[PDB]
Design a protein around this ligand. Sequence first.
Ligand SMILES: NC(=O)c1ccc[n+]([C@@H]2O[C@H](COP(=O)([O-])OP(=O)([O-])OC[C@H]3O[C@@H](n4cnc5c(N)[nH+]cnc54)[C@H](O)[C@@H]3O)[C@@H](O)[C@H]2O)c1
Ligand SMILES: NC(=O)c1ccc[n+]([C@@H]2O[C@H](COP(=O)([O-])OP(=O)([O-])OC[C@H]3O[C@@H](n4cnc5c(N)[nH+]cnc54)[C@H](O)[C@@H]3O)[C@@H](O)[C@H]2O)c1
Ligand SMILES: OCc1c(F)c(F)c(F)c(F)c1F
Ligand SMILES: OCc1c(F)c(F)c(F)c(F)c1F
Ligand SMILES: [Zn+2]
Ligand SMILES: [Zn+2]
Ligand SMILES: [Zn+2]
Ligand SMILES: [Zn+2]
Lengths: 374, 374
Amino acid sequence: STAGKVIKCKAAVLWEEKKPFSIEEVEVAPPKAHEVRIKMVATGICRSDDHVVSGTLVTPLPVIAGHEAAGIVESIGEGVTTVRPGDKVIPLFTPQCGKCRVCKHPEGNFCLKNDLSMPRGTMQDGTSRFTCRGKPIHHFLGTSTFSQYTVVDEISVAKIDAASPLEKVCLIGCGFSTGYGSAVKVAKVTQGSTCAVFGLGGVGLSVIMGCKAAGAARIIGVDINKDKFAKAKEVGATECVNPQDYKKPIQEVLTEMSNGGVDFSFEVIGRLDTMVTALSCCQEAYGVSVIVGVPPDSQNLSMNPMLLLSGRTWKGAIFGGFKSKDSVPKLVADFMAKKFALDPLITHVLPFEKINEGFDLLRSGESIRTILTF
Amino acid sequence: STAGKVIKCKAAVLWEEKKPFSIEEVEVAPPKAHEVRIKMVATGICRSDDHVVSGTLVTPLPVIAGHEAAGIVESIGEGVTTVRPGDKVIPLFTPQCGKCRVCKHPEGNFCLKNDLSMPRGTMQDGTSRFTCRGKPIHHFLGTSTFSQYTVVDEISVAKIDAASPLEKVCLIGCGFSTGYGSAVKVAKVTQGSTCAVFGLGGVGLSVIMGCKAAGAARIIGVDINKDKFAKAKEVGATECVNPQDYKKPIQEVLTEMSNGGVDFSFEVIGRLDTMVTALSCCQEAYGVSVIVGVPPDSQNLSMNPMLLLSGRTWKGAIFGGFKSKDSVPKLVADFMAKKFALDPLITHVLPFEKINEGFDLLRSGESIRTILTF
Ligand SMILES: NC(=O)c1ccc[n+]([C@@H]2O[C@H](COP(=O)([O-])OP(=O)([O-])OC[C@H]3O[C@@H](n4cnc5c(N)[nH+]cnc54)[C@H](O)[C@@H]3O)[C@@H](O)[C@H]2O)c1
Ligand SMILES: NC(=O)c1ccc[n+]([C@@H]2O[C@H](COP(=O)([O-])OP(=O)([O-])OC[C@H]3O[C@@H](n4cnc5c(N)[nH+]cnc54)[C@H](O)[C@@H]3O)[C@@H](O)[C@H]2O)c1
Ligand SMILES: OCc1c(F)c(F)c(F)c(F)c1F
Ligand SMILES: OCc1c(F)c(F)c(F)c(F)c1F
Ligand SMILES: [Zn+2]
Ligand SMILES: [Zn+2]
Ligand SMILES: [Zn+2]
Ligand SMILES: [Zn+2]
């Protein structure tokens, strides 16, 4: 029995930037008041985890990364009311406190209790539940899912269907929900519209899924890796284009293809240049462009505000605009009811001990999502 | 008595940037097919006209500027169906052809026949109706209202109520409609919200009017000229701030004042730095910022796209988002029914012959709108 005790378990510790994860024993403290300790079942490899490795995202190190996952509650601290030991759960990298001005707003989801903006790498109480070789180890986004066991604040976990296949629904913890919601909730793609999706990884494929669900007539996938095109078409892309194939800038190509600009464009890469290209390729008077990707820390883009003055709308979002704790259980129920598919995003399934090999698959271009299984 | 004949009349010709207008005789050709010749009655001085003089806005010179006006149809070309001689009309600097993909879109207004994006300074047929000293003179935005007579394409004119006071409703041709629509149509300001309005000229005052009409609870005016604050409060500002009074950047001041950011902000000046400040000061998860001010020609702003990734929406618009020919007559009818006031915008009245004094008043900071009478 482990309840109320320190757990010694295996985790993937990132000691410094641009190094492999170290798979080794950590100590996981028991949960405090309003905290939940979770036995991990499956976690996906999201590009945002790689950004921590590459230094694209700045967060306190050493760290246990991982934010796209699912597991089973091992124990609860005093005062927890929303989950119980044995429940299937998804950690929420965007919390839902329910009390802040954002949580109370009908269209906000970026709860003020988040650890993204100005990352501390801690629990809500400003402390860590992790140690390794006698050193405190930081949390990541309140989730830290690259560990056999994590501790999360109650506002950072959702209870899901007891019959959920956790090796699939972990993707609802980040990439699926983000892409799908970016299309259906943030952009509000319309029936009959033309969409352009920049970046055909797990998140961009989920954007395509959402654009198709919303009834788009044309969905143009854009990627410099033509090996991504077949799966993009399988999930709804009507055309795919590789910028490297053209003498013209791809905003000009997409404007010509769409007879004057697209209805909706999505940046799903993380480059400043593609954010401006994606804005430019939407129709100047009524186009909408959504930033989904994460670019390098502290870098500004340059753009001409006449792109906006003519009528364009430019927005971005975290986690597809979904209020995380309300939405995750409903997305899992919708998946269980066959309303969308997750298998098209899963290219590789590896044991957790092969985390580095999973990152190498992402970095090489081979994979979409690798699911690590504990 | 003048139908089919060249009209000799006085106009304000701009031969050179950074110089006074020259009030002198021009020759105004009769209207060709689908053209309308208008005897002007009143025209406002909008800062965009001054942008032509300063080179902030690049359009071919020499030019007859003016775009905010009202007059009476003197004659119609072959095939004109929407106005008749003797009708009161407002020229439309944003056309409404009714046929292009923007005109057909429910939310588009920046008609593809516009002369704003890449100005030619001509009629729709690529020619000029104006001669001065034997030289062809450019049109401006298809309107050229700084003339006793102008010729406009049919898609650039709207018939208005025959009982309209033209010395008031000329403001519906640019500044009032732009500001009011930016709030009520583009931003869609909500009841009980907090708004910030950067720039308290004629357009920014019109934005305040729209925010108040939409039921905003707080409307914070921002201007470096504190002489603008009294009138801003008269039309609905709940408080005014001068960035020059503060040690900290005004985005930080406004975020503090609004307990974490405003619901809606508006840039109504034309500066790259205030466009980014206005975006920053709206709440990071659900705020909306609208660019109204005209930026300096060909200059790019610099900004961190993390401002959008958190959830902000950034947009701009021409003419308040209003489909011009549909909307202008309705706005005049609503003015006639006292649904909004125009007198708060009118600080000065001059004869057309004193156009240069009218620009001096705008440049000194003294005026809001000067209305010129022909
Ligand atoms: N906003 C959010 O909440 C959120 C959620 C999840 C992921 N992300 C970010 O979204 C982005 C995509 O994540 P992912 O799908 O896991 O990554 P991924 O699987 O690496 O996919 C990125 C795709 O972009 C392609 N690509 C790279 N450069 C270019 C280019 N110049 N032009 C066109 N295509 C290019 C690349 O070939 C690949 O297929 C990353 O920046 C993530 O950090 C954001
Ligand atoms: N989008 C459109 O369709 C449209 C329509 C009409 C006007 N415009 C533009 O909107 C802008 C405002 O026009 P207007 O109301 O006639 O001009 P205006 O009367 O010159 O008003 C601008 C106000 O900005 C104030 N100001 C100047 N610098 C700053 C600063 N750094 N911080 C805060 N306030 C400052 C200034 O004191 C003045 O009261 C101009 O750029 C116009 O070209 C756009
Ligand atoms: O992939 C989701 C995700 C984000 F969208 C971020 F903006 C971020 F900073 C991060 F750490 C993250 F995991
Ligand atoms: O004031 C209205 C107005 C604009 F909003 C412009 F963008 C522009 F180029 C212009 F000439 C103009 F008059
Ligand atoms: Zn919250
Ligand atoms: Zn992610
Ligand atoms: Zn049109
Ligand atoms: Zn104007």
